[PDB]
Amino acid sequence: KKTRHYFIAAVERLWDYGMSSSVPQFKKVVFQEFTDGSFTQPLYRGELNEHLGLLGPYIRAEVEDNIMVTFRNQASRPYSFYSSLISYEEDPRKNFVKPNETKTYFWKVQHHMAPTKDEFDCKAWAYFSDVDLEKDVHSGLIGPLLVCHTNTLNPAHGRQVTVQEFALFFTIFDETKSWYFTENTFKENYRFHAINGYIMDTLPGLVMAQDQRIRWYLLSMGSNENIHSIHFSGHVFTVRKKEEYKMALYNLYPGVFETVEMLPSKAGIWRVECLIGEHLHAGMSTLFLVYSNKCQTPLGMASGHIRDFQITASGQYGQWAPKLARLHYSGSINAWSTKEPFSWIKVDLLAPMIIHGIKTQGARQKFSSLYISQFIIMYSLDGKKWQTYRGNSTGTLMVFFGNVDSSGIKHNIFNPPIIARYIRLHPTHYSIRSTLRMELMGCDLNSCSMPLGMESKAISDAQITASSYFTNMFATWSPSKARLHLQGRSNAWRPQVNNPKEWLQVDFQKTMKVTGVTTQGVKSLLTSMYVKEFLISSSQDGHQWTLFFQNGKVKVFQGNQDSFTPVVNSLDPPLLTRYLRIHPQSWVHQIALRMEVLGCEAQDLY
Amino acid sequence: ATRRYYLGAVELSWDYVVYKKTLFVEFTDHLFNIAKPRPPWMGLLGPTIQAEVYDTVVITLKNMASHPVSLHAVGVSYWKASEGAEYDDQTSQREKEDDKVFPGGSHTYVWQVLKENGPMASDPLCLTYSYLSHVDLVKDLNSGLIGALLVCREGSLAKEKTQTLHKFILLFAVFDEGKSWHSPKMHTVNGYVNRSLPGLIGCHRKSVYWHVIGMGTTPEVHSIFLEGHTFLVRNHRQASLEISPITFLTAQTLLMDLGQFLLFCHISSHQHDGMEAYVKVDSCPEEPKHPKTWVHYIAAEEEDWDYAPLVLAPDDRSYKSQYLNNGPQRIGRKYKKVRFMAYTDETFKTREAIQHESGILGPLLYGEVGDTLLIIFKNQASRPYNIYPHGITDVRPLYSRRLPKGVKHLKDFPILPGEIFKYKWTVTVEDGPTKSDPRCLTRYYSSFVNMERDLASGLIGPLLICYKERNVILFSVFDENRSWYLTENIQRFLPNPAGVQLEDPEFQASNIMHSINGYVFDSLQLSVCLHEVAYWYILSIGAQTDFLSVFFSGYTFKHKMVYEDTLTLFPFSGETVFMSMENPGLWILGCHNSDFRNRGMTALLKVSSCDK
């Protein structure tokens, strides 16, 4: 069993919560995760622990283990380390560390500082400077220090692994305290109702799956007001203590670090708030996304659904542009490439989105393997100030592996999943030119942009009929053939006569939330038939249809241009329903429809 | 497996000559109207909604108010067109209609109750939660929008009819009336103030269950007691319920003895604020090794007291020299008090030795279930004082019941200066620890001739009721400002005491001694042998108004089979802990309240090697 070793220091920063949709300074002090004894590199905080915020880092350990925290006061005033557990030797009694000074504390974890067989796989414990047990908090020094059961933390790979851990900490930050009374007495203002130091909605980092159970490490701290009654909207938890108890609200007293586990409900973007009125409309709300990852789906660099703009380069080699950068682009006139040294390429997904993985590619030249070899990823959720991706516990940032040939097709998954509007890919090694075809794998925010079954045959056969259909002694263009990919004998729906006020009808079994529809044509050895333009009516009851308007507009949808090519329309307000019905207005040679539906499960019934 | 509730959000008019606001309610209509006959005591409380662990509740809200209001349930799940709260659903309006129902606005909700949302293996039969308006909280709570929401295992009054348990819904509400749509202040129990609220009845032999909801807008806390009677939470004997900010807990009473009993809130400044009502208990018809006698002779005794012994910090330089270092108008350090001292026999001269360890406290009363204490108490001192213990329930004078002379209860009966009285404190499992309980619960004994003068004058000591199978820390603030002796002390400790003034900004502080065991300012140290392992019976008592957060520098203690960092002490609770204690050095045991702990209020703890 191991010696955990932590290079931690105490740093001075600016603090703010000058949001994301004028603004105040504040020299606060924090615990900073450093790197070698030199305290030269600080350890870049990855997507992993983005949420810690104002906290210093997770100091983790198993029980039979040792902890060693070599600590450096890179600050202005004297501070200390101190937790409870931090146990000494024996025969002038105690300590603090002066500025520009290093102290070391090393001690064996006992079962006396661990979780009982009855608790949870880990227990959280608090650490903070005890130079002024009161002021050296408001100033900014607290972190969590987790003791875990043996064989629970994963070797080398950082710590734990099979549950996502998150540590929330609720205080009033009152900068009348804080050794830092610089400044830019009258009567009152600076009370921050902060969760890991983020007032109103600021706390940025709660990305978590709709499977993995989460344990949340909860802490309050100080002023006898700090009695924060914590709620997790539409979610419950369990508590350790004697036996396991199920609860929906847990009250924090000062100092009581509390470990609770939960398995999250339905996917989406929810809140955690201190339910005591005043305390809330003072800033406690803070959000978390539970995404599904049974929703990975192509972001549409496949089909030109990501239109020819919204893809940029650092530069390019002649023509051989990005744009031509889509996965599978054919011809040898294809894919982005520069021989310029350190290039990059960027997609505006034109909207905030979860992106689970990128698929990468090369290109033949004459007889010249042309592929991107190694690369890293950057991304932004706004546009201006960017970010680098360090997937799970790695080191400095996560290095990806591209192709090793002109057509091989690496699909690197975003382990923890990137959460951006924009995504930028910079090459680090290459074949002979950094060359790239690629598709993005992702899904919208709310995890609800998925195939609804038409193509899946997931939607039943006679779960669809239409306003009539063509059929004769030979063919049968049954409505039940309107299936996005279906290769068949006569393979699509077609009505018998061609009518402007014609339709095809899908009965969703239950009530479904719709993102949009992907439409299609057919070839009949005859000619290409497709629908050019169309309208959606929806119902609810079976016979009472209220057609899809857009904003006074009766939304006139933008259909295909060929036999093949799935072309897809999003929905203005996403459409809750049981009854869907596209309405071919003007077509090409015939009305002909293959098609699928996009979306998922809503308030099923009333 | 399905439960529709026709709920509506009406503004009516409150009280039992004052106040009037908007709150929840029943109705039976299909379109809008009257229909919902509501029972006595669910005061203003929105109707109690109640489902099982597979059922689906379907509240159809009507909002009849001029208020914009919602319907936010806690502890049950839904999609994002129930929940009824507005942030970043991100969703379309048929998905944000729940979030804020506008005045005149009917919109329906749906909650389900998955194997998940339901009550754990070994907790309660129904978990206590509740619902509310989540659109201005402070606006909405305070006006009257909170219904009781109960989630429940497979057995229930709408499936499994013979659930015949006796159960009320206690809502301990601090309603601010100037934070309403007031454009002032009630402070109740179910909407009933001072002590109306009829309901409250339990059957003599059997037991009674409370679904408790703490509610308020702000962190102001409570300590609820029910006369004579103790509680069950989780599974621990708790003799107070301790209601916080916003607290759903679910608790049991079991009422022997017929009568009427007040429950209420012990904390000081709430006394008149009138959160309290009566519970009665008359008989329903149903089908119409061998224990010891623990004996002590205890006395009330006027000694002088030194709050900070060997330790001076000379010069009025300080902020401590000011509580201690006596001055032109500050008694400081040394006051005349009246403690319990323990003597040897029927006569009272000569006793067992004073406690550097457990300072001001009277002697340690102990007794196991079955056991009987036997308190012969003499009062040597100038005021009628007495002894009652809190925790225990069987306290009669020794040879009879019929409590002497006039007094309808013994706690109030005063022992005259110079008389002796013989008391039998018999102990019974039903006021002692359970299997879950830290098997040896801490408690205290005092003088109820003037609940707190008689305490804040010097009269306490500790009491341990323990199971039928020592280190006492007491966190006390003594307000010498009203000792009974205050006056006497002044005419003896001060520049010939003319210019008096009891009331006085700064001076008044000089006499408020913040103390562990009657010792202040890192005076009182404790020795222990490193490795020697200890039970510590800690209690805040007479440490006026607030809660505590006790410390122990560099030490972890087992509070109720779990390992902790810092224990939390309400008013007149006393919690009992365990020191796996092999960590050497000088450790500053104070409290990580840093308000108090430099008004005095810390001790030191030395851990080092011995030789038994």
Ligand SMILES: *[C@@H]1O[C@H](CO)[C@@H](O[C@@H]2O[C@H](CO)[C@@H](O[C@@H]3O[C@H](CO[C@@H]4O[C@H](CO)[C@@H](O)[C@H](O)[C@@H]4O)[C@@H](O)[C@H](O[C@@H]4O[C@H](CO)[C@@H](O)[C@H](O)[C@@H]4O)[C@@H]3O)[C@H](O)[C@H]2NC(C)=O)[C@H](O)[C@H]1NC(C)=O
């Ligand atoms: C990035 O870093 C994070 C950790 O911080 C990790 O991210 C992902 O985490 C997952 C959780 O460990 C890993 O995948 C698997 O999850 C499956 C969950 O499904 C279970 O379902 C059953 C019901 O039948 C339940 O009882 C369980 O509690 C689960 O909910 C597991 O199946 C799986 O565990 C395995 O089970 C198989 C069964 O075939 C066994 O043969 C095997 O012994 C094993 O225990 C596992 O836990 C996954 O590591 C990871 N995924 C992704 C796409 O990122 C990763 O560690 C990091 N990702 C990297 C490096 O790519």
Ligand SMILES: *[C@H]1O[C@H](CO)[C@@H](O[C@@H]2O[C@H](CO)[C@@H](O)[C@H](O)[C@H]2NC(C)=O)[C@H](O)[C@H]1NC(C)=O
């Ligand atoms: C219940 O009634 C009222 C609260 O509304 C309390 O009345 C007190 O008495 C005075 C009389 O002048 C009032 O002005 C105040 O409302 C209170 N004042 C003081 C100084 O206490 C009363 O406390 C309550 N009754 C009980 C039994 O608790």
Ligand SMILES: [Ca+2]
């Ligand atoms: Ca909603």
Ligand SMILES: [Cu+]
């Ligand atoms: Cu709070």
Ligand SMILES: [Zn+2]
């Ligand atoms: Zn109260």
